[PDB]
């Protein structure tokens, strides 16, 4: 069925508009949560002690509560008390309010993970929803009605891909010796480089996703692939900012930047600053031997269905940008 979670994260105008853009969110509405009364209004907030919140109805088949929270973490200061941006006050406190007992454990785990990486003392409170009142219809869909309205957060973050670092694992070195070809092993494990113009993917122009051949972790979208003329698969950026790592490479009497996968720590290739201007200028020059391409039609079967709308939206954007 459909599930609900209530999120207080400062300005509810931008928050509501943000959550609405997340894939899996059926509806987002503005409101007032966990105050001292059973009903209030926008200029009785300071007395009712309600927090400006967003009621988020989501499809648990399409997005989990855990990933939904991690989208929410991207647009709030998790350590500040009663303040987000320039909005000061108790109605701007951060909080997560649940109506299902089983949601408490998920929320608590997500906050500890968030804390374990951004550090500090997480100020986000966690309580069951006690009393709630839907905001005035003047406040509903506010940024749709006022495209120049106040919005402190970056709504583009809602289009970013989140890749779970715990659903892909690197098999043992002994398993990789049987699962990978000789070439794939040397490239990914010993930093060799396959031959340019003689590898499977450098000239592939097909919609889908490229994953770490050693772990299955998503790495690159077909929407960011382009023809570099260099003979290796070339991308303008990874599928998000978390899946690849960067390291100095001083071999071959050159100085270069090696790119590696986050989970598998596999050698992928290198990143250069000679990519096409209109795509950002970077060239991620990746070995086919480090990648496994999964076409759009196959992504659901292979366990990557939650990334399909992201590949397709990327390919629509590439399609339109071509039309200039």
* Parent domain of 21: 3-159
- Same structural domain, 128 and 204: no
* Residue where a domain stops, chosen among 159, 185, 206: 159
- Same structural domain, 70 and 41: yes
125-128, strands of its sheet edge to edge: 125-128, 94-98, 3-9, 51-58, 25-33, 132-134
- Same structural domain, 8 and 154: yes
What residues pair up with 51 in beta bridges, in sequence order? 33
- Same structural domain, 52 and 100: yes
* Residue where a domain stops, chosen among 128, 159, 190: 159
| Resolution value (Å, 1 decimal) | 2.2
- Same structural domain, 12 and 130: yes
* Residue where a domain stops, chosen among 108, 137, 159: 159
* Distance, CA of 78 to CA of 111 (rounded, Å): 9
Please work out, in degrees rounded to the nearest 5, the angle formed at the alpha carbon of residue 159 by the alpha carbons of 86 and 106: 80
Please work out, in degrees rounded to the nearest 5, the angle formed at the alpha carbon of residue 165 by the alpha carbons of 160 and 170: 135
- DSSP one-letter string for 139-168: TTTHHHH-TTS---S-GGGGGS----TTS-
In a domain, 102, yes or no: yes
- Same structural domain, 7 and 154: yes
In a domain, 167, yes or no: no
* Distance, CA of 7 to CA of 58 (rounded, Å): 13
- Under 8 Å between Cβ of 59 and 23: no
CATH for 229:
2.170.150.20
- Same structural domain, 90 and 234: no
Residues 6+ apart with CB under 8 A from 323: none
End-to-end CA distance of the chain: 43
- Same structural domain, 147 and 37: yes
* Distance, CA of 210 to CA of 293 (rounded, Å): 5
- Under 8 Å between Cβ of 209 and 218: yes
The conformational region for residue 215 under phi > 0 = left, psi -120 to 50 = alpha, else beta, is alpha
In a domain, 307, yes or no: yes
| Cα-Cα-Cα-Cα dihedral sign, residues 313, 157, 145, 63 | positive
């Amino acid at each position: 069925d459909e599930r609900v979670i209530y999120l207080a994260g400062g300005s509810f105008w931008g928050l509501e508009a943000y959550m609405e853009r997340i894939y899996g969110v059926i509806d987002a509405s503005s409101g007032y949560a966990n105050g001292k009364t059973s009903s209030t209004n926008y200029e009785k907030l300071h007395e009712s002690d309600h927090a400006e919140s967003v009621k988020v109805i989501y499809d648990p088949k399409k997005i989990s509560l855990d990933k939904l929270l991690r989208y929410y973490f991207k647009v709030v200061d998790p350590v500040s008390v009663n303040k987000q941006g320039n909005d000061v006050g108790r109605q701007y406190r951060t909080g997560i309010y649940y109506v299902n007992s089983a949601d408490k454990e998920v929320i608590d785990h997500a906050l500890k993970a968030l804390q374990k990486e951004v550090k500090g003392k997480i100020a986000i409170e966690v309580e069951p929803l006690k009393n709630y009142v839907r905001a005035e219809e003047y406040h509903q869909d506010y940024l749709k009605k006022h495209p120049s309205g106040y919005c402190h957060i970056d709504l583009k973050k809602a289009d970013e891909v989140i890749v779970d670092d715990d659903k892909y694992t690197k098999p043992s070195d002994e398993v990789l010796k049987k699962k990978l070809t000789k070439l794939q092993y040397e490239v990914t494990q010993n930093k060799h480089t396959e031959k340019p113009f003689e590898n499977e993917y450098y000239n592939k122009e097909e919609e889908g996703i490229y994953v770490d051949i050693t772990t299955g972790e998503p790495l690159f979208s077909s929407a960011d692939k382009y023809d570099s003329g260099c003979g290796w698969p070339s991308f303008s950026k990874p599928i998000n900012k978390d899946v690849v790592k960067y390291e100095d490479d001083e071999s071959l009497n050159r100085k270069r930047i090696e790119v590696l996968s986050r989970i598998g720590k596999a050698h992928l290739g290198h990143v250069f600053n000679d990519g096409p201007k209109e795509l950002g200028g970077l060239r991620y020059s990746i070995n086919s031997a480090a990648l496994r391409f999964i076409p759009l039609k196959d992504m659901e079967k292979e366990g990557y269905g939650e990334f399909i709308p992201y590949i397709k939206k990327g390919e629509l954007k590439k399609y339109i940008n071509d039309k200039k």
